[PDB]
Guanine nucleotide-binding protein G(i) subunit alpha-1 (Homo sapiens), 323 residues
Amino acid sequence: REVKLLLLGAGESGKSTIVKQMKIIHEAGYSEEECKQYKAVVYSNTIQSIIAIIRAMGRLKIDFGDSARADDARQLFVLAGAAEEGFMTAELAGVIKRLWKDSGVQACFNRSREYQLNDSAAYYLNDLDRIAQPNYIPTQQDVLRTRVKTTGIVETHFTFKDLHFKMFDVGGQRSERKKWIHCFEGVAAIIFCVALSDYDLVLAEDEEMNRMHESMKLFDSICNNKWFTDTSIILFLNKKDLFEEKIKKSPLTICYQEYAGSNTYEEAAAYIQCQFEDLNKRKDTKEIYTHFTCATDTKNVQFVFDAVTDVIIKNNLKDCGLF
């Protein structure tokens, strides 16, 4: 009835992005007042994050595209106090919206690698309209996107098809991987995110290494893990939308030298999927449920997730001795 899900994958694979969606798609998670407790923290983080960018601007000698934005910046600090107290007025909201859209602010944000920026900056700022709404009640991810300090493991609760799901999510980067073992306990199914678009990118930890090759290493370990023999295994080729366009621009041989297919979404995407599914040492006794997803797309994620749920209900239910 429950179903603990665990999101695994290398860094920047969009694991948390999935959590963003579940909050909206699913409701009635017996958590209304609890989310209200975190409303003040969400707003507080939004203000500090945009101020983090603006802070970097001065450091980098970046001016707002529109001179008027400077006035919006001055006001931001005055009104910011209200957001910190759990209230976001129409004035405070609009000010943050204009700064976020400005060409100069976006110039800094884009070079966020240069300075420390709030992880949830692009989450609340892009979704600013929704959280600024009257009587805003945070959802599962909205809470998870609070507190600059590391909370630990991103947890999420939502009911779907009369199943109380506890979805969990942990950093992908090499450093965070250690924590994964904590989550290994009580896991019904695993969704392993892989960045399709990362085929020509390299690890932040090591420019020399390929992000997607890294992802293959992790998937090999989870799928063939004795502990996860009984746990359902789901592959989530994420960032399909990014991959569809990117493949046209860049060749796939960057990742897979042996690949001799065309630079098309269907062939290249289908080729990755093949590399990962092959890792399954036990093709005969172990199944992988693969779907192409776009974490930012609420619709697409809902549809794929529905299919995943059916797999859990039919598979996870009773222990199996044979096969």
User: Anything to note?
Assistant: The chain has 14 helices and six strands. The CA atoms of residues 119 and 145 lie 8 Å apart. Strands lie at 4-8, 154-160, 163-169, 189-195, 232-238, 289-292. The first strand starts at residue 4 and ends at 8.
